[PDB]
Design an enzyme around this catalytic site. Sequence first.
Site, short mmCIF file in Angstrom:
data_model
loop_
_atom_site.label_atom_id
_atom_site.label_comp_id
_atom_site.label_asym_id
_atom_site.label_seq_id
_atom_site.Cartn_x
_atom_site.Cartn_y
_atom_site.Cartn_z
N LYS A 7 0.83 -1.21 0.00
CA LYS A 7 0.00 0.00 0.00
C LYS A 7 0.87 1.27 0.00
O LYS A 7 1.85 1.35 0.72
CB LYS A 7 -0.93 -0.02 1.24
CG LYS A 7 -2.06 1.00 1.22
CD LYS A 7 -2.67 1.20 2.62
CE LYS A 7 -3.56 2.42 2.67
NZ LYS A 7 -4.35 2.50 3.94
N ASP A 10 -11.31 4.80 12.45
CA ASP A 10 -11.66 4.77 11.03
C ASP A 10 -11.17 3.46 10.39
O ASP A 10 -11.09 3.34 9.17
CB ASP A 10 -11.19 6.04 10.29
CG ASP A 10 -12.00 7.28 10.69
OD1 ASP A 10 -13.24 7.14 10.90
OD2 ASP A 10 -11.41 8.37 10.79
#
Lengths: 322, 312
Positions: free
Chosen positions: A113, A241
Site C-alpha cells: 500500500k 476509522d
Amino acid sequence: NLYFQSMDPLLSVLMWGVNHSINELSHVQIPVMLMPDDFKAYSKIKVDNHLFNKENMPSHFKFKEYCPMVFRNLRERFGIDDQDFQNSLTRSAPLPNDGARFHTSYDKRYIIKTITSEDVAEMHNILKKYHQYIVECHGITLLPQFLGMYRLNVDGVEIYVIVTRNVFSHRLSVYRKYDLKGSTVAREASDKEKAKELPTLKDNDFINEGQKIYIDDNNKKVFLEKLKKDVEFLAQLKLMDYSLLVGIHDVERAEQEEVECPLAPGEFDPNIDVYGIKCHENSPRKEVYFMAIIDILTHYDASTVNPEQYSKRFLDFIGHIL
Amino acid sequence: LYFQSMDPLLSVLMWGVNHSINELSHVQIPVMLMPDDFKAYSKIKVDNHLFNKENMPSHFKFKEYCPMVFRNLRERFGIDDQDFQNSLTRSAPLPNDSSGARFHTSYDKRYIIKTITSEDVAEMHNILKKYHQYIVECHGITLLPQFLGMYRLNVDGVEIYVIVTRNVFSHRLSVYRKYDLKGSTVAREASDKEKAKELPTLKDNDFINEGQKIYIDDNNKKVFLEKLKKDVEFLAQLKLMDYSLLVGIHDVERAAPGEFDPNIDVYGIKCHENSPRKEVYFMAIIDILTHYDAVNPEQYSKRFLDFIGHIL
C-alpha cells in the site's frame, strides 16, 4: 533469474529494495531481543548508475528501510521466512489492484500500500506497543500483520509503502468483498463501484443484500473474543476509522468458473491463509470466509466520535451482523 | 559473513565486492561489450542510522569502475564470480605486513588488492579498451597483470582507490626468494632494511651478485619469452613503462612436493629435470600503469626484454 523489470520504475526500485534489504539482513546477526534503538532505526541507500544496467533499472534512485530489525522479527513472529518474503516480492513484479495505490505480490500472499508521511509517523509511534502486542498474543490477531516499511525515490517522485500479509487467500478466489465500519452513517457502494468486477461493498450493502456469515458457534465466539482484544488495543492507541474487511469464496461458483478453462475445494492451509474460516455443515452454499481488521493508522488527534465510542459502535455492529 | 574488520576500509571493500557481484547476477551477460561499457560505473551511498553499528561503519560510499568489462575479463581469465566474491568476502584480506601503496592479499592467497591513485584509475580507463581487446586476442594467455576489479571506497572522509589482480605467486606453495627485475642501466639493489625482512624484494643487481639461475627447459623458455615479447610490445605501444618482471622461487627440497594446479597458479613453471635444485618459478609482469606523459617506452621495452633473455 530476476532483473526486477517493470513499466513502473517505482516497482523496479521496490523489487531491488526488498531484495537488497533481505540480503543485507543475512549479513546482520539475529538479536537475542530487540532494543529501543531498533524502533527509531533505518537504512538509506542512494544508487547512481552511469551507463550501467540502463535497460532493466532506473539509473538514479533512493531506498530507505524503516526499523529493519523490528520488521525482520515481526516477519518471523508471523511465520514468514526472509528468503520466501524476498522471492514473493521479486520473482515477478507485483500487480496493481487497478492516491492510496494497492499492489498484490504476484503469488497473492502480500499486499503493498502507498501510504503518507503521517502514516509512517503514526506507524513509528505505535511500533513498540504493536511489537509487544504481537509477542503477547503469539502472532494470533485479526490486526494487520505489517512486514516491512520503505521510502522510495525515483525521477523526483517520493512514495512511502507498507507491506502487509493479505487478508484474502493466495489460492482461493473471492467473489464478494465488504469493508465494514457501521455506526455513522449512509456507508454504501456507489453505482460506479458496483460496476467493477470485484466491488468493495459497504455496511448498507451487507444488510440490503441479505448477507449472512455461516460459521459455527465456536468460531463465532473465538472470532468475536479476538476482535474485542484487538479493537480494545486499537482504542488504547487512540486509533480509528479502521474496518473489518470480509471476503467470501464461493466453492461451487469457483468450480464452474474453472470447468470453463492435494487440497480439496473449500479447503485451505490456515498456516498460509491465516484469516480463513470454513462455513458450518448447515450452510446453504459451501463458502469460505476471510476476515481481518484493516486500515488502522488514523489517529484521533489528526458531532464526531472519539476512539472509545468508535470501538464500541464497531464491535456492536460486527456482533449484530455475526 | 558479517564483513567485520578492525580497518573500516576493508569492511567497505568486503561489502562492495559482495554487493557488486550480486548486482551483476541481476544484469544480463551481454554478447559483446560496447564503448559505453568502457566508461560506465556503479555508485552506491549507504547511510545507516542505529542499524548494523557493530559490524559496519554507518556512513560509507562504494563505486565500481566498468562492471560489465571487469566481469567479462574475469570470465576470460577462468575466474568464476561466486568464487571471486567468496575469496574476497568470506574472511578479511590480510595486509602484506604494511598512507602509501598498501597491499592486501585475499584470505585464500588467490587475489591481490593494491591501493592506487586517481591518476592510475584514469590510466586504467585510458588502456582498458586496448587491454580488453588484447586479452580477447591472446585467449587469456599472457604474462600481463590480470585486472579483475577496480573500485573507489569512502568512509570517515578517507577516499581510496583499489585494483584487484590475480596473485603471481601460488595460493599454496610458499616463495622463499623473490625478485623485482627491470634490466635498467642504474644500480637497482635491495636496501639493508629490505634485505633484513622475512622475504625481501630483491632487484636487478642482487640477482647477478647472488648468481641466481632460473632453470627452465627449452620448450617452456621459448613459450615464456614469446608471451613476454608480445606483452612488452603491447605495453610499449601504450607508452607504458617502469614495469617489472616479478620472480618467485619455491624450494621443493625445503619442504604433493613440487606440484601445483596450472589453472589456479597460472604463472607457475616447473624447473628443468637436470636442475641442481628442485624449484618452482612464478614469473609475470607487474606495476604497468605509468605513462611516458608523466629512456622512452620503446627503449625501456628492449632494455627489459634483453635482460630477461640474458637471465633466461
